[PDB]
Amino acid sequence: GAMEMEYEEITLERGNSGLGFSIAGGTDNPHIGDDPSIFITKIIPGGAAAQDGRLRVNDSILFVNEVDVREVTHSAAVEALKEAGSIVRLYVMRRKPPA
Amino acid sequence: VVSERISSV
């Protein structure tokens, strides 16, 4: 109707345990019953993105590296996080509060 | 749920 959205850009360094989260998404592989976009469902209590970075399960990814993850496979969204070498740059989507 | 896997970075 009359309700609009607000976007956030975060920069992370590649973790010793494997960052401190897990990602559900695909073009050929589903989550709910045949999915187009990549969404959050698993968070770790002692990782690098939960304590040092500032990412929550309710934040959801559109773009990774400044690269197009809106229409890709599961292995094609993990190879943007494992191949960058030491520095990974993520773009998230969240709805506007009344106060 | 029905078709998932999840275990990623």
Side-chain angles (χ1 to χ4, degrees), chain B:
Chain B
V1 288
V2 292
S3 295
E4 195 179 82
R5 293 180 180 179
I6 189 54
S7 296
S8 297
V9 197

mmCIF file with all atom_site columns, all heavy atoms in Angstrom, chain B:
data_model
loop_
_atom_site.group_PDB
_atom_site.id
_atom_site.type_symbol
_atom_site.label_atom_id
_atom_site.label_alt_id
_atom_site.label_comp_id
_atom_site.label_asym_id
_atom_site.label_entity_id
_atom_site.label_seq_id
_atom_site.pdbx_PDB_ins_code
_atom_site.Cartn_x
_atom_site.Cartn_y
_atom_site.Cartn_z
_atom_site.occupancy
_atom_site.B_iso_or_equiv
_atom_site.pdbx_formal_charge
_atom_site.auth_seq_id
_atom_site.auth_comp_id
_atom_site.auth_asym_id
_atom_site.auth_atom_id
_atom_site.pdbx_PDB_model_num
ATOM 1  N N   . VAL B 1 1 ? 12.782 -27.714 4.782  1.00 0.00 ? 1 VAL B N   1
ATOM 2  C CA  . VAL B 1 1 ? 11.316 -27.977 4.424  1.00 0.00 ? 1 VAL B CA  1
ATOM 3  C C   . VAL B 1 1 ? 11.123 -28.471 2.972  1.00 0.00 ? 1 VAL B C   1
ATOM 4  O O   . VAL B 1 1 ? 11.360 -27.696 2.002  1.00 0.00 ? 1 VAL B O   1
ATOM 5  C CB  . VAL B 1 1 ? 10.193 -26.831 4.885  1.00 0.00 ? 1 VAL B CB  1
ATOM 6  C CG1 . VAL B 1 1 ? 9.958  -26.853 6.385  1.00 0.00 ? 1 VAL B CG1 1
ATOM 7  C CG2 . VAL B 1 1 ? 10.483 -25.337 4.411  1.00 0.00 ? 1 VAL B CG2 1
ATOM 8  N N   . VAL B 1 2 ? 10.685 -29.824 2.836  1.00 0.00 ? 2 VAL B N   1
ATOM 9  C CA  . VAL B 1 2 ? 10.416 -30.649 1.489  1.00 0.00 ? 2 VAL B CA  1
ATOM 10 C C   . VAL B 1 2 ? 11.681 -30.922 0.509  1.00 0.00 ? 2 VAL B C   1
ATOM 11 O O   . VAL B 1 2 ? 11.807 -32.029 -0.071 1.00 0.00 ? 2 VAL B O   1
ATOM 12 C CB  . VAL B 1 2 ? 8.968  -30.368 0.660  1.00 0.00 ? 2 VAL B CB  1
ATOM 13 C CG1 . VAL B 1 2 ? 7.749  -30.869 1.444  1.00 0.00 ? 2 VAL B CG1 1
ATOM 14 C CG2 . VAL B 1 2 ? 8.700  -28.875 0.189  1.00 0.00 ? 2 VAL B CG2 1
ATOM 15 N N   . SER B 1 3 ? 12.618 -29.841 0.411  1.00 0.00 ? 3 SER B N   1
ATOM 16 C CA  . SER B 1 3 ? 13.892 -29.674 -0.448 1.00 0.00 ? 3 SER B CA  1
ATOM 17 C C   . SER B 1 3 ? 14.657 -28.460 0.133  1.00 0.00 ? 3 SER B C   1
ATOM 18 O O   . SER B 1 3 ? 14.165 -27.306 0.042  1.00 0.00 ? 3 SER B O   1
ATOM 19 C CB  . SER B 1 3 ? 13.644 -29.541 -2.046 1.00 0.00 ? 3 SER B CB  1
ATOM 20 O OG  . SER B 1 3 ? 13.098 -30.727 -2.609 1.00 0.00 ? 3 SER B OG  1
ATOM 21 N N   . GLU B 1 4 ? 15.840 -28.762 0.898  1.00 0.00 ? 4 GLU B N   1
ATOM 22 C CA  . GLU B 1 4 ? 16.674 -27.719 1.667  1.00 0.00 ? 4 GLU B CA  1
ATOM 23 C C   . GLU B 1 4 ? 18.254 -27.831 1.382  1.00 0.00 ? 4 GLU B C   1
ATOM 24 O O   . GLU B 1 4 ? 18.788 -26.991 0.626  1.00 0.00 ? 4 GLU B O   1
ATOM 25 C CB  . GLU B 1 4 ? 16.249 -27.704 3.278  1.00 0.00 ? 4 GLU B CB  1
ATOM 26 C CG  . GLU B 1 4 ? 16.684 -26.510 4.176  1.00 0.00 ? 4 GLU B CG  1
ATOM 27 C CD  . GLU B 1 4 ? 16.213 -26.608 5.656  1.00 0.00 ? 4 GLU B CD  1
ATOM 28 O OE1 . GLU B 1 4 ? 16.881 -27.304 6.473  1.00 0.00 ? 4 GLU B OE1 1
ATOM 29 O OE2 . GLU B 1 4 ? 15.181 -25.977 5.998  1.00 0.00 ? 4 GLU B OE2 1
ATOM 30 N N   . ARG B 1 5 ? 18.984 -28.928 2.022  1.00 0.00 ? 5 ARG B N   1
ATOM 31 C CA  . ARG B 1 5 ? 20.550 -29.151 2.158  1.00 0.00 ? 5 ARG B CA  1
ATOM 32 C C   . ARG B 1 5 ? 21.228 -28.220 3.267  1.00 0.00 ? 5 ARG B C   1
ATOM 33 O O   . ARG B 1 5 ? 21.844 -28.756 4.214  1.00 0.00 ? 5 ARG B O   1
ATOM 34 C CB  . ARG B 1 5 ? 21.430 -29.257 0.786  1.00 0.00 ? 5 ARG B CB  1
ATOM 35 C CG  . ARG B 1 5 ? 21.170 -30.499 -0.089 1.00 0.00 ? 5 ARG B CG  1
ATOM 36 C CD  . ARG B 1 5 ? 22.052 -30.498 -1.338 1.00 0.00 ? 5 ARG B CD  1
ATOM 37 N NE  . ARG B 1 5 ? 21.808 -31.716 -2.217 1.00 0.00 ? 5 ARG B NE  1
ATOM 38 C CZ  . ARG B 1 5 ? 22.404 -32.081 -3.457 1.00 0.00 ? 5 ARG B CZ  1
ATOM 39 N NH1 . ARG B 1 5 ? 23.361 -31.339 -4.102 1.00 0.00 ? 5 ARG B NH1 1
ATOM 40 N NH2 . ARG B 1 5 ? 22.009 -33.211 -4.029 1.00 0.00 ? 5 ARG B NH2 1
ATOM 41 N N   . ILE B 1 6 ? 21.034 -26.779 3.127  1.00 0.00 ? 6 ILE B N   1
ATOM 42 C CA  . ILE B 1 6 ? 21.508 -25.581 4.047  1.00 0.00 ? 6 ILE B CA  1
ATOM 43 C C   . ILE B 1 6 ? 23.072 -25.396 4.344  1.00 0.00 ? 6 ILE B C   1
ATOM 44 O O   . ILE B 1 6 ? 23.552 -24.259 4.201  1.00 0.00 ? 6 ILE B O   1
ATOM 45 C CB  . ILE B 1 6 ? 20.411 -25.085 5.314  1.00 0.00 ? 6 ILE B CB  1
ATOM 46 C CG1 . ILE B 1 6 ? 20.719 -23.695 6.174  1.00 0.00 ? 6 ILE B CG1 1
ATOM 47 C CG2 . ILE B 1 6 ? 20.131 -26.193 6.360  1.00 0.00 ? 6 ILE B CG2 1
ATOM 48 C CD1 . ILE B 1 6 ? 20.935 -22.361 5.441  1.00 0.00 ? 6 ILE B CD1 1
ATOM 49 N N   . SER B 1 7 ? 23.816 -26.546 4.750  1.00 0.00 ? 7 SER B N   1
ATOM 50 C CA  . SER B 1 7 ? 25.345 -26.616 5.179  1.00 0.00 ? 7 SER B CA  1
ATOM 51 C C   . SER B 1 7 ? 26.400 -25.909 4.166  1.00 0.00 ? 7 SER B C   1
ATOM 52 O O   . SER B 1 7 ? 26.978 -26.526 3.203  1.00 0.00 ? 7 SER B O   1
ATOM 53 C CB  . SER B 1 7 ? 25.764 -28.069 5.636  1.00 0.00 ? 7 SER B CB  1
ATOM 54 O OG  . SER B 1 7 ? 25.066 -28.482 6.806  1.00 0.00 ? 7 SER B OG  1
ATOM 55 N N   . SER B 1 8 ? 26.477 -24.512 4.403  1.00 0.00 ? 8 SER B N   1
ATOM 56 C CA  . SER B 1 8 ? 27.213 -23.438 3.595  1.00 0.00 ? 8 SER B CA  1
ATOM 57 C C   . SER B 1 8 ? 28.104 -22.475 4.559  1.00 0.00 ? 8 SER B C   1
ATOM 58 O O   . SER B 1 8 ? 28.411 -22.867 5.730  1.00 0.00 ? 8 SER B O   1
ATOM 59 C CB  . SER B 1 8 ? 26.136 -22.610 2.695  1.00 0.00 ? 8 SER B CB  1
ATOM 60 O OG  . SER B 1 8 ? 25.487 -23.434 1.742  1.00 0.00 ? 8 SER B OG  1
ATOM 61 N N   . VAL B 1 9 ? 28.542 -21.221 4.013  1.00 0.00 ? 9 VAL B N   1
ATOM 62 C CA  . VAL B 1 9 ? 29.437 -20.174 4.694  1.00 0.00 ? 9 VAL B CA  1
ATOM 63 C C   . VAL B 1 9 ? 28.572 -18.859 5.012  1.00 0.00 ? 9 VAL B C   1
ATOM 64 O O   . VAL B 1 9 ? 28.646 -18.401 6.147  1.00 0.00 ? 9 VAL B O   1
ATOM 65 C CB  . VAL B 1 9 ? 30.895 -19.828 3.844  1.00 0.00 ? 9 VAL B CB  1
ATOM 66 C CG1 . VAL B 1 9 ? 31.967 -19.116 4.694  1.00 0.00 ? 9 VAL B CG1 1
ATOM 67 C CG2 . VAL B 1 9 ? 31.602 -21.072 3.225  1.00 0.00 ? 9 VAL B CG2 1
#
